[model samples]
Target: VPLMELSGRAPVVRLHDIEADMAAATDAIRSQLTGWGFMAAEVPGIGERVEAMMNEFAAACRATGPSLSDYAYDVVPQLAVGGTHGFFPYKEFIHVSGAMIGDQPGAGDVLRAFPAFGTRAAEVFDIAFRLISLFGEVVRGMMPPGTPELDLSHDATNLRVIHYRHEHSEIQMLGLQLPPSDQGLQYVLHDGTWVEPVIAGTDVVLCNIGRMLTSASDGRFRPSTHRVHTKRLSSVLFAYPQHKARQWKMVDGELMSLNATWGDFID
Candidate 1:
């Protein structure tokens, strides 16, 4: 039995098999992103970046000190695209790999740690930009007609590329709410605390924003608090507010307004 089942956790949806149909996959990804506040897509475009970070992390591991490892985790949080931070890869102590290949033991890490972890920082940035562009297109398609389309060019776009390697303890590090409509906000109990269930996969991308979207949508669009618990690589394209002084409330006469600016909500 899988740990998730043993602990009684279910992913909002799984896309391993859904990739065969792009349309189905896109719809499913969009549904979960909107309904559960997060979603995973088999977007292979981000895979190379994952491999590059993993290899770099492994090399640093052998450099004879905490300097490299420390730098990987510490410096990662300091960088960001579009003024957003927390875009980098680091190690974790858990069960699972974030690489594109999951077969065989250590297959994921080995791939990233060896030669061929040929992903350049420039390449990763380029892919991130492309993904953000795709995100903008998707947003336009999802919004109501005449609704002001999202402007990725604005400093508000908070997209990022994140990678993870779990080498620590065996603890659940991720969670997802079953949408606000689920009165109780369904949760799974593990080790006496409630945790959001997660779906494990590789060569994929899972995206979410901090809390700006929830505030922007007046709570109608939820933002989930997810954690990493395995040796996995994940990229997040966060499109959010660059300035706290900006209003995060939903616009469009059809949508109800909220009284929160990025600053008001964060502070």
Candidate 2:
């Protein structure tokens, strides 16, 4: 312990120095997406090529029977505690759908048992659709004013490659981070404190703020409620829009609306 010390509460954008500093990486992605919804990017060698593409897609989800519904995978247990649905009983997922990689669904027996996993899962969803078109052109120019620029396209985008047992799977895939670790992702701060993001090196590349980017930014960003734990190998990338699209949220000045598209919240 040679005077070791480190601490980070999400905020690290260096994705190749944003081409020699593109306004300091869009002002650190607009000040860490309106004060730490989450941000981390150095994108150097995408965490050893997504930790060898999540250990070669967890070795084709540990073949010989290949379940997770023969690769349809959506085994999400539950959310918001209790049951609004069911299926809660620990998790294990995998849903690589950046518009059906090689015709999705277990891709012909995982490319007939790993034939270079369809060119490394098509360059990891082409680096998750160019990191969702460079974070949707810097959150659509730090939206807000009559906001309406959310269209990541690439078939709405999605790439969840989770893991367990072989490892917090040291999460940092698609979200980057190969060597950096702390534990299975966990974040929730802004005053309510409860973090677990710990990046120390190896070009971190993590960013959050889902919930359709807090209703297309009418909330002005900040919608990162995360969770994960124990065992390793995990991946993430959920960029959507393109339906009726438009969304909003305000209050005092009033706005609050939700057009809802993108699969219409499962019809």
Candidate 3:
């Protein structure tokens, strides 16, 4: 079958559908994620509020950079918001770790700094986990028995509110993005063909399987190779497995190496 058509249908399913009939939902979701590596989903409340909050963050980003208070998870060379430095450091983002979600460190300060982003960020964080739970079910069905669960740590994930100023040229794919935003993002299909997902409405949240999750699952999942070609302000949650989970290398569902953990695989 087709992984994804060139400039054709945007593979999608709704949250309520998944909740109402998980088995059927998984079949459609898993098939797309398996080949296309991305799925466009409609999650509630991810509309105007999300767009507004993220835009607010973007507007203030130039003046207010990411400070120590924004710290939750560890990522080196934490650049000031809008500071373009480092290897192709074109990406200027507000990196709010998943750790910042609950009562974890930097929670209060981040909340105070970004009121709109705070509550909604947590709400979306919860939604991601719900999606994860559904993904876990897919993992169980796809992988062989005794497949270690995709146990992810809250502190391990990252919530990046990005203001990408590509404005023109770009060729890349960072990985898993649950963004409730508009265009400028483009991705490749199973082959090398590319397609840009034209998101409809506000509640639509496009989910990429993410490369790390694909590896962790022995290549059962597809992490869409994607990149932003134009300037755009957006928000996305980067999903990752728990740092402590045992990680082993695999190629096309075959174990190739061993002795590792999730952190070692990506970080």
Across 1-267, the per-residue lDDT of candidate 1 in tens digits comes to 123221122122222332233344456656655655544444433344455544563454455533333323233332232132321333331111122122223223322443233234324433444444444345445554553444443333322223332111111111211111111112222223344333232334444433554444445544455434332333333343333344534455255444554435444
Of 2 and 3, the candidate ahead on TM-score is: 3
lDDT-based ranking: 3, 2, 1
Task: Write down the RMSD of candidate 3 (Cα, Å).
Answer: 6.3
Taking the tens digit of each residue's C-alpha lDDT, what string does model 3 give over 1-267? 112222224324455565554455667666766666666555555566567767676655543376422433243333232111111223566555555554353344655566666676666556655665565566457776555566555565666666653212111112234543556577777777777665523455556665665665555665556666553667666656555566754455565546776556654
Which ranges in model 3 have alpha carbons more than 4 Å from their true place? 1-18, 21-23, 62-90, 165-176, 200-202, 220-222, 249-257
Ranking by TM-score: 3, 1, 2
Could you tell me the TM-score of candidate 1? Answer: 0.48
- Misplaced by over 4 Å in model 1 are 1-26, 34-36, 58-119, 144-146, 153-201, 230-237, 251-267
Give stretches of model 2 more than 4 Å off. Answer: 1-23, 27-42, 47-51, 65-93, 96-137, 140-158, 161-236, 239-246, 249-256, 259-266
Clash statistics: count for each candidate: 19, 6, 2
Flag clash pairs in model 2: 167-231, 168-230, 168-231, 169-231, 169-232, 169-233
Question: How displaced is residue 60 in candidate 2, in Å?
Answer: 3.5
Query: How would you encode candidate 2's per-residue C-alpha lDDT over 1-267 as one tens digit per residue?
Result: 011122333334444454444345677766766776665555656666667777776666666564334434233322221111111123464544444554433333433445565466557667656655666667667664554455565543556565562112111111332333235555665776656655433445566666555544445665666555444666666655544454455544455666754445434
lDDT of each: 0.36, 0.50, 0.53
Q: Between the candidate structures 2 and 3, which one is better when assessed by lDDT?
A: 3
Worst 10 residues of 3 by lDDT: 166-175
